[PDB]
Ligand binder design. Structure first.
Ligand code: GTP
Ligand code: MG
Lengths: 20, 170, 1003
């Protein structure tokens, strides 16, 4: 198995976006 | 605005005076200067429903300085019993302080406080502290030195005496 | 001095006034009741005063007389005081307003009667109990008050007699109560079955509660009292709480174990009780969480007491209820009430139920055939625990003595310990049903996402719950579960509006991943993304995020360090190389403390590097920035200490040293080369700052110690001591510590310590030396002598004027003496005799402290010293020691034993005294101790004379009998301590019985 999807999503974690 | 007599009891050196003095002036005293008999200190907290006032009767924990002893407890409307989690004997004496207290004041809100939880070699381990259960005391770990749960004993008492669970200090 | 009216006024000014006048009244009152003649003022106060507070004080005065001097009194006065107290109690009972409103005063009078009973009963008051029983028919008030009297007698005899009475006296009073209890029980049972008056019945049940601590179970099981407690007194509101307390103690009785009848009785009272609670109080469906928040009447205490009863009974008796299928519904209803109680927002009540749930879920795990009975209970329990998870990590923010703000994690707190208990229960429950657990936590998370249960508290709490069950699900289920959770949280973060909300959820993602190191280690790519994300967060200025980022970085590397030092498939280099290279950019926006944490994290990783050349290389690279700064500033600043008047330079230097400290803390032994790189210039720096600090304190005094300038300098000084202490404490190569580190260290710190003025000497110097002696003291006998010479007398002088000044120095001094005495006693043998006397003096001075942190070490040193001397054979230092000091230690030990306020030292005081006595009674001292009489007789004589001088009210018979016991019991610690406790009781009073010291043999 792998975690490639999850790693890419986590790399998008952004507390300064405004997609609220 | 009413005033509530609060008696503060427990073994010598456990932190009673230094807890109160920090509450009054913001400063923390490092020296141990044993209390002789009692000192009464008015202590006010401002709340979201107004001012609350305690007359804090800070009693001596050393036998040789005990003074009037349980005679300090007459009229008390609440109490804190303090011990020191770095010293097992001070927890061993908590039932003796409680006994002398409630023989005078049958039905008052009491908080039990284990102080000095900042210190690295804790001797009175948390699992060990159960005396308050059968006596219906509140319990908190505190640290007068490091500001841990510093207002909680007064907050719980204030709520109890004002009959107001929503009361908050401000 | 003060007649009745004026005493009344003083009391009323003390209790009802304030300020300065209240304090002046206090002093009058305190002196008055300490007056040995005060007790003649007292009856008069009791006869004539109009003030219940005056009468309380008069009773306290009489208690002092009763407790201490009663047997000095003529038999006339005794019977007079006794008749007076009895009649006064009866008047107060027969006066309605007083009986209503002066209960503390009647309770005090009752306790005074009990003090007399302790002296007089039953041997000189055999009719007391039948008289009391008789007078209870005379009045309902008197009867009620009689229950208070019997309750206090029970407490004073059974619960509180240990240490307040001799062992012999306590046995006599317990046997006396035991013999007369049949009649007290008769009265008690009669009132419970007939009485109306709730206040009388409540008093009766309060006394029963105390009797249950000691009475034989047959009073409970062979009468009808269980029926009354479980039916009658549960139905009436005012008796509910006290009846549950009684039934809690019934459940703890010593009862036969192989007896069907007793088992049925035990089931029946619980059956009755739970039925009565459902009929008369509240059904299992009631929302106790809301009832408890309401707080009507005494309901909170009742519910607390119900939790106690249920958990007490069930922890002991659950298998009994499981053993018959007709009991199933009782079993389950009892558990369902517990589930409801567990939802109440009151932490101490929650912990009480949690202790029981722990017992239960362990038992289901280890006997899973039972598991089907509790499925529904367990399901609701997962939810309760999840919803009440507390935070597993807590940080204290404090200002130190140099004014810096310092974050420290709390260890072993009540909160932390509750987290651990919660986790253990939830681990068991997870294995009991992993699908249910998973569903509960996923749907809980869905209700964060749909907003219905959203809040910072709820998402944090759910995160702590989820993070607590790592290693429960099996690796593959865990993988899927964690993927699902993390994705749900990543969407939740995107969905929430506002930086505050997104920071909370982001911090919880980082929390959950830190708690699943198997999941992290399985996929390097994911781990590496986590770390790079944390590094992004180290630039985020939003409150708390940088600290969260640094804390998670070090937490993760503690667990996954290996993955940073190897070269991973598909990467050109070990990730530690990458971290080190971008370290300046990565940390640029961190505060200094955070930067130090980062460097500490790096050192964890580097210690994992197995090859020494490569590890040293990594260390060298890691330290490039602080070394560059060091190499450009420090030597220069030390050759012209006028460059350190720049507070900005002092700041930069402090932070360099703290960077070293941080790296050393994690690398320990592996830090050697970096320490070596800065060592000699670091020690020149120490001297230059210590000189400047002392110079200014000398000229300006104490207040110079609070200045921004002196604080910055003291920081450098203390960090240098911290770095050396930290390294030496973890060193593995002790040869280098001794050959390279110690000698420069001692030359730099010791003479400077001695020459500094008292207010510039740092206690941390003593701490550092303690670590040096602990670690390599066996290898540096000459260094240890230097340590003593430099710090011994000058520190003793700071702390021997009073007990209160230089608190840190007191504590560190006796710690250092203790370790020197354990590890290099030879240094004490080299002292000149006058300095050795000072050492003995210092040990005795520690004994006299009301300060547990000093006292313990003083006592331990004395014991260790005596063993050290005892291990030297028949040799003249030994024999000289004994002739010079044996008796100094005997009387000093006795002096603190008999003092009011050195009770924490009791155990070691006893041991020391046993050891001293053995030295003589085991004929281990080869010389005579006096200037062919044996040392045994000389010792007994010394002791009789010492004791009759310190305690002149003791009789010769009391002293002969105590000493005869002590000298026979000194191999048996427990018995020996019992005799000492008896002695401490007898010295507080006149007329003790000398036959008390025969208690051990009479047995
Ligand atoms: N480490 C630590 N020390 C504390 C804390 N609170 C108080 N102390 C120290 O413990 C000692 C407590 O002294 P006091 O408060 O005078 O003692 P007390 O309980 O009033 O004693 P008596 O008046 O003798 O009954 C002082 O040396 C304090 O500095 C704490 O939270 N942590
Ligand atoms: Mg005090």
């Amino acid at each position: 198995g792998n975690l490639n999807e999850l790693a890419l999503k986590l790399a998008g974690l952004d507390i300064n976006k405004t997609e609220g | 605005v009413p005033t509530f007599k609060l008696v503060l009891v427990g073994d010598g050196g456990t932190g009673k005076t230094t807890f109160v003095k920090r509450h009054l002036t913001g400063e923390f005293e490092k020296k141990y200067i044993a209390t002789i008999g009692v000192e009464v200190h008015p202590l006010s907290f401002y709340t979201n429903f107004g001012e609350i006032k305690f007359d804090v009767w800070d009693t001596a924990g050393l036998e040789k300085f005990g003074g009037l002893r349980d005679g300090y407890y007459i009229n008390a409307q609440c109490a804190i019993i303090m011990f020191d989690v770095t010293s097992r004997i001070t927890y061993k004496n908590v039932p003796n302080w409680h006994r002398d207290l409630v023989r005078v004041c049958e039905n008052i809100p009491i908080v039990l406080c284990g102080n000095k939880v900042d210190v690295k070699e804790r001797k009175v381990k948390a699992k060990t502290i159960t005396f308050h259960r059968k006596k219906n005391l509140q319990y908190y770990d505190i640290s007068a030195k490091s500001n841990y749960n510093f207002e909680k004993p007064f907050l719980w008492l204030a709520r109890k005496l004002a009959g107001n669970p929503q009361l908050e200090f401000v | 001095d003060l007649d009745i009216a004026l005493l009344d006024q003083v009391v009323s000014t003390f209790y009802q006034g304030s300020g300065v006048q209240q304090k002046q009244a206090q002093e009058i009152l305190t002196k008055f009741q300490d007056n040995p003649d005060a007790w003649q003022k007292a009856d008069q106060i009791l006869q004539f005063s109009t003030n219940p507070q005056s009468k309380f004080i008069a009773l306290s005065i009489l208690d002092k007389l009763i407790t201490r001097k009663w047997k000095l009194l003529p038999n006339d006065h005794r019977i007079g005081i006794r008749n007076f107290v009895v009649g006064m109690i009866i008047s107060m009972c027969q006066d309605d307003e007083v009986f209503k409103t002066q209960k503390n005063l009647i309770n005090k009078s009752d306790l005074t009667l009990v003090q007399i009973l302790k002296q007089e009963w039953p041997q000189n008051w055999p009719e007391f109990i039948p008289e009391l029983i008789g007078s209870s028919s005379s009045s309902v008030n008197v009867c009620e008050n009689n229950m208070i009297v019997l309750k206090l007698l029970s407490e004073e005899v059974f619960d509180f007699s240990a240490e307040q009475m001799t062992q012999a006296k306590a046995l006599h009073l317990k046997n006396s109560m035991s013999k007369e209890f049949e009649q007290i029980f008769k009265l008690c049972f009669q009132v419970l079955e007939q009485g109306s008056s709730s206040s009388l019945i409540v008093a009766t049940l309060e006394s029963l509660l105390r009797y249950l601590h000691w009475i034989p179970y047959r009073y409970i099981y062979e009468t009808n009292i269980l029926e009354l407690l479980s039916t009658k007194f549960m139905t009436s509101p005012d008796t509910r709480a006290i009846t549950l307390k009684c039934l809690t103690e019934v459940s703890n009785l010593k009862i036969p174990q192989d007896n069907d009848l007793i088992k049925r009785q035990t089931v029946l009272f619980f059956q009755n009780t739970l039925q009565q609670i459902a009929t008369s109080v509240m059904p299992v469906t009631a929302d106790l969480k809301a009832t408890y928040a309401n707080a009507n009447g005494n309901d909170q205490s009742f519910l607390q007491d119900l939790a106690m009863f249920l958990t007490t009974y069930l922890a002991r008796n659950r298998a009994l209820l499981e053993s018959d299928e007709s009991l199933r519904e009782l079993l389950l209803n009892a558990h369902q009430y517990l589930i409801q109680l567990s939802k109440i927002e009151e932490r101490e009540l929650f912990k009480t139920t949690l202790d029981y749930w722990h017992n239960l879920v362990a038992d289901l795990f280890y006997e899973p055939l039972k598991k089907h009975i509790y499925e529904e209970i367990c399901s609701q329990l997962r939810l309760v625990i999840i919803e009440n998870m507390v935070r597993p990590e807590e940080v204290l923010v404090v200002e130190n003595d140099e004014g810096e703000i310092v974050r420290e994690f709390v260890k072993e707190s009540d909160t932390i310990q509750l987290y651990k208990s919660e986790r253990e229960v939830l681990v068991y429950l997870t294995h009991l049903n992993v699908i249910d657990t998973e569903e509960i936590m996923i749907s809980k998370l869905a209700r964060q996402i749909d907003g219905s249960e959203w809040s910072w508290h709820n998402i944090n709490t759910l995160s702590w719950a989820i993070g607590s069950i790592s290693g429960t699900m099996s690796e593959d289920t865990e993988k899927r579960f964690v993927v699902t959770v993390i994705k749900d949280l990543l969407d939740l973060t995107v969905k929430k509006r506002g930086k505050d909300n997104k920071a909370v959820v982001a911090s919880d993602i980082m929390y959950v991943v830190g708690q699943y190191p198997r999941f992290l280690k399985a996929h390097w790519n994911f781990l590496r993304t986590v770390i790079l994300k944390l590094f992004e967060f180290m630039h985020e200025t939003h409150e708390g995020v940088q600290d969260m980022a640094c804390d998670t970085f070090i937490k993760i590397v503690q667990k996954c360090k290996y993955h940073f030092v190897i070269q991973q498939p598909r990467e050109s280099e070990p990730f530690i190389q990458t971290i080190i290279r971008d370290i300046q950019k990565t940390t640029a926006d961190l505060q200094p403390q955070q930067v130090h944490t980062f460097y500490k994290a790096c050192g964890i990783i580097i210690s994992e590097e197995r090859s020494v050349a490569e590890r040293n290389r990594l260390l060298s690279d890691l330290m490039q920035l602080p070394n560059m700064a060091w190499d450009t500033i420090v030597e220069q600043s030390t050759a012209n200490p006028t460059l350190l008047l720049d507070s900005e330079t002092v700041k930069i230097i402090a932070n360099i040293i703290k960077t070293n400290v941080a790296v050393c803390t994690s690398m320990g032994a592996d830090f050697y080369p970096q320490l070596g790189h800065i060592y000699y210039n670091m020690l020149q720096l120490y001297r230059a700052v210590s000189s400047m600090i002392s110079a200014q304190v000398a000229a300006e005094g104490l207040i110079a110690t609070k200045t921004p300038k002196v604080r910055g300098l003291r920081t450098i000084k203390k960090e240098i001591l911290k770095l050396v202490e930290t390294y030496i404490s973890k060193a593995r190569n002790l040869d280098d510590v001794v050959k390279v580190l110690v000698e420069p260290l001692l030359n730099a710190v010791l003479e400077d310590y001695m020459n500094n003025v008292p207010d510039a000497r740092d206690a941390e110097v003593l701490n550092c030396m303690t670590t040096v002696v602990e670690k390599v003291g066996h290898m540096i006998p000459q260094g240890v002598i230097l340590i003593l010479q430099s710090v011994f007398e000058c520190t003793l002088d700071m702390i021997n004027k009073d007990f209160t000044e230089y608190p840190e120095h007191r504590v560190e001094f006796y710690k250092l003496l203790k370790v020197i005495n354990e590890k290099s006693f030879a240094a004490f043998l080299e002292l000149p005799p006058a300095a050795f006397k000072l050492f003995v003096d210092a040990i005795c001075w520690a004994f006299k402290h009301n300060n547990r942190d000093v006292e313990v070490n003083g006592l331990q040193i004395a014991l260790d010293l005596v063993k050290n001397i005892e291990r030297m054979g028949n040799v003249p230092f030994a024999n000289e020691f004994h002739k010079n000091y044996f008796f100094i230690f005997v009387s000093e030990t006795f002096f603190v034993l008999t003092d009011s306020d050195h009770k924490s030292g009791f155990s070691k005081q006893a041991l020391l005294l046993m050891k001293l006595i053995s030295l003589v009674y085991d004929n281990k001292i080869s010389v005579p101790l006096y200037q062919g009489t044996s040392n045994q007789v000389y010792l007994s004589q010394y002791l009789a004379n010492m004791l009759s001088n310190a305690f002149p009210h003791l009789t010769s018979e009391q002293i002969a009998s105590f000493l005869s016991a002590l000298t026979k019991q000194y191999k048996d610690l427990v018995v020996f301590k019992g005799t000492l406790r008896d002695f401490l009781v007898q010295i507080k009073e006149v007329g003790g019985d000398p036959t008390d010291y025969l208690f051990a043999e009479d047995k």
